[PDB]
């Protein structure tokens, strides 16, 4: 109803520090959302300024 992706599982609920987390269910594939200020592979660190 809501689209094609329930947010993320309930396992996996953290797969990046700074960054949201979206879920293929369509061929199960979690994946991350960093938002624009944050740097890392897992956006651990953050961007100086901007």
Known sequence: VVSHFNDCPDSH???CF???????????????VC?????????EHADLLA
């Not at 938002?35 to 956006?43: L, N």
């Open 35 to 43: 938002h624009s200020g944050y740097v890392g592979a897992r956006c």
């Open 13 to 15: 609920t953290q797969f």
């Open 18 to 32: 700074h960054g949201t987390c979206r879920f293929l269910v369509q061929e199960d594939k979690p994946a991350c």
